[PDB]
Symmetry: C3
Subunit: 217 residues, 3 copies
């Protein structure tokens, strides 16, 4: 027996629950296991879009040794804190992908990724902990994505790009390919704004916007 959950019942979680259902019902062929929302805003259980939603205290109390959780919270510092709590409590992080999520050859993705519909992870890609690839995003050949990286929808991450931990890439941003000799680096905790056209390395902690991408003033 197993129990599944989506941690976060706000906009991120509500648009991931259908994906978690494709993962569980179709890709794992599991029509038996329950799936719920976990949300720490809750005191008493409620329902969200026809799913039971409970706080983490109540989820822990469920008498099952085999719990699997997708963290659907876009803020990556919260996501890391939750992931460390879940692993410490003996709960498994659970990667979810949609029926239209495309994974190519020699891809490595750490447990707990949220891979939305129409996402492509292309050849020879390595991805770290609890990656969020929102709708239509791609990661192309030979990229290395670090831990707790977050893509908004429709991110174009071209080949030979290294995105360091906790970076955020905004809606529709486009990133120029690197080369094998010089991968294009998005630094730790950088924020690439929606619609940014990134042609050069982004420093750690920088916020860049515009076409072409410049530091936000």
């Amino acid at each position: 027996s197993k129990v599944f959950a989506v941690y976060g019942a706000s906009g991120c979680g509500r648009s991931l629950m259908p994906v978690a259902n494709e993962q569980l019902r179709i890709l794992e062929g599991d029509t038996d296991s329950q799936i719920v929302f976990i949300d720490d805003a809750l005191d008493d259980n409620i329902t969200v879009n026809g799913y039971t939603a409970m706080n983490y205290t109540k989820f822990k109390s469920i008498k099952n040794d085999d719990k699997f959780v997708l963290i659907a919270i876009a803020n990556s510092s919260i996501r890391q804190k939750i992931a460390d709590k879940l692993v410490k409590d003996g709960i498994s992080l659970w990667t979810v992908q949609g029926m239209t999520t495309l994974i190519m050859d020699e891809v490595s993705i750490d447990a707990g990724a949220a891979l939305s519909p129409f996402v492509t992870i292309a050849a020879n890609v390595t991805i770290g902990k609890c990656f969020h690839a929102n709708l239509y995003s791609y990661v192309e050949h030979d990229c290395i994505i670090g831990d707790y990286v977050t893509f908004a929808p429709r991110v174009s991450c071209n080949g030979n790009i290294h995105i360091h931990d906790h970076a955020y890439i905004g809606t529709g941003a486009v990133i120029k390919q690197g080369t094998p000799d010089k991968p294009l680096i998005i630094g730790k905790g950088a924020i690439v704004g929606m619609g940014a056209v990134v042609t050069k390395e982004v420093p750690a902690g920088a916020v860049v916007i515009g076409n072409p991408a410049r530091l936000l003033n």
Copy 2:
């Protein structure tokens, strides 16, 4: 018995007819009913891409009580005029979606929408009359789309956005999320240009272009 049509045999209709065929042949499992084009430019019937195409006078004359029409005319003032004519004539508006159109939980869409391939309508979205969602567009969580709204291809409509009646959103435009306390409003009859990066409310009747979006001068 039933008869189906795509109203408009120009570029919009010709790229929607295959979608109307996925809707009818696969999603409704209907291999019997005829589907035609209606176009008021026609005097004598012609064929368009192997489909009979006729004017509305001839379509009305068809002796069938059960007619279903998708309006494939991008101009929303024409679309409203046609929709009101069809309903007055006792003809049903017909929503079409592709095999790759993704609809999530608790979505409401008024009859007569044209939902193209690779479109996502995410959680808890409400959409009004004869919506056009062209190829690759998405509407994310908790959006409210009004009547006769038109998306070009690849529109990124993020969460908590309210698009009022007759707005037009151009190819590849990206719209920043609102919040539940302050939804981001695109005003009635506004035009968001192709590639616009919208970070703020757009006034009724405004035309905005650029990154970031500004009034067209």
Copy 3:
């Protein structure tokens, strides 16, 4: 009997090999024929992502009358040189598309196209020799694409656009529709930069960037 290959085992080829496998194993229903990489950087054969990879001398030496090659080299002058060599050697150019590639009515595509996943080729489109349509690109109604044209991922090529030979369209670029009376022309060997918003004809050999697109200075 037949043998298949992807010519180019770098990033372009490695992200096309899974597509060539969808084309061969699923769309042609062929679980028998071998598929390999050809790459002229090789002296001795190697393996790339679990596929035999050999130089063109070794591929020619294979005793099979029935060879089919997809050229997965983005540089269109190299692609033309290879295509002419293959045809002169009596080897067939091979169009590949993914399971999620959408082709609409009355489309003509010359042999040897690389049509990636999530690509749409819409109604009444004509495409010339060895077209590259990378991930998520579309070509909308009544376009004419010439020979050895290359789209990066997520190109939005709207209706009534004529793209002349050897043009390159960069990641996420958006091109305004033409009209039947005035198709919007992208000239021979033009380069449209990633994220460019093209609202006007692009001269032959021009390099354009930005929103709106201007000559690169």
